[PDB]
Write a protein that binds this DNA or RNA. Structure first.
Lengths: 152, 150
RNA sequence: GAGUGCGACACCUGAUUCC
DNA sequence: GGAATCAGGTGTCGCACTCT
């Protein structure tokens, strides 16, 4: 178990073997600490892609948190897409019929709508962790997602 | 060792620990009791790619020392072979960017190797997994020997 | 509306060598 | 298993132009 001031630190990550190929396998992973009862690594239900696993691994961590009555959180993910989406983009997407900058429709709307819904009632600091650069937290969350993508 | 007027040479690098004291070696073999057969220490940052590349570099300097311009080069470093026979064309065109849009790490090394190849007619031969070729084994022996000497 | 670049962070597939 | 390294891909977005 780890913390920064009053915020408990959590790591999330998604993965997907054969992303954009013929047989995609996507998984989610959240790491709270060594041997933490809350660490999970499971198979991502639905459309298999890296983007959804990254968004959905972040959703899982928040659900778990509410489950522990946690309201302050530092969420580390190596997914700028997830971050930018939830902390910038969704705001504008809501005032424009969910439309890309190329007049078309935002592909992960349901993933971001599900995410934003979870963020109600949560002071969360979305911090980017560079992937594959020695951050135990992020390697483990990646380890956990790979294991989860090896499932159901 | 000659394939016609083309003379044959074997090159190889090595680097164990590739974490603590990455030690890198360079070896170039021309044949039984040849005055230019050498095993020496890789200068600079120690990696396997750098030793394989500078092993080729070393051999080409030696060829020139012998007024050789048609050279057949044997190495098991497909990375070296690919950078020099076909990737450098694109890197000099795209500002030395990788397919992932990042910077070519061994840029310095390939530029030096490319410089040495001006005026050289060189055939790059990949020596596979494992074959006989005492040439490759010798070159290997040379590299591991040069692996220790600052 | 159609399209083309560019940037960024991920997610991969593959290959050879060095351990 | 890992490192050193590269080539080809998709997943997705914003940003910046141009319509033969």
């Amino acid at each position: 178990g780890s913390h920064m001031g009053d915020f408990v630190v959590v790591y999330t990550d998604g993965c997907c073997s054969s992303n954009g190929r013929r047989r995609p396998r996507a998984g989610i992973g959240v790491y709270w600490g060594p041997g933490h009862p809350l660490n999970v690594g499971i198979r991502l239900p639905g459309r298999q892609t890296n983007q959804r696993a990254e968004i959905h691994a972040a959703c899982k961590a928040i659900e778990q948190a509410k489950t522990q009555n946690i309201n302050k959180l530092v969420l580390y993910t190596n997914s700028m897409f997830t971050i930018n989406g939830i902390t910038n983009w969704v705001q504008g997407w809501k005032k424009n019929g969910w439309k890309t900058s190329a007049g078309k429709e935002v592909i992960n709307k349901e993933d971001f709508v599900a995410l934003e819904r979870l963020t109600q009632g949560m002071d969360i600091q979305w911090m980017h962790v560079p992937g594959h650069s020695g951050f135990i937290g992020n390697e483990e969350a990646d380890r956990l997602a790979r294991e989860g993508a090896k499932q159901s």
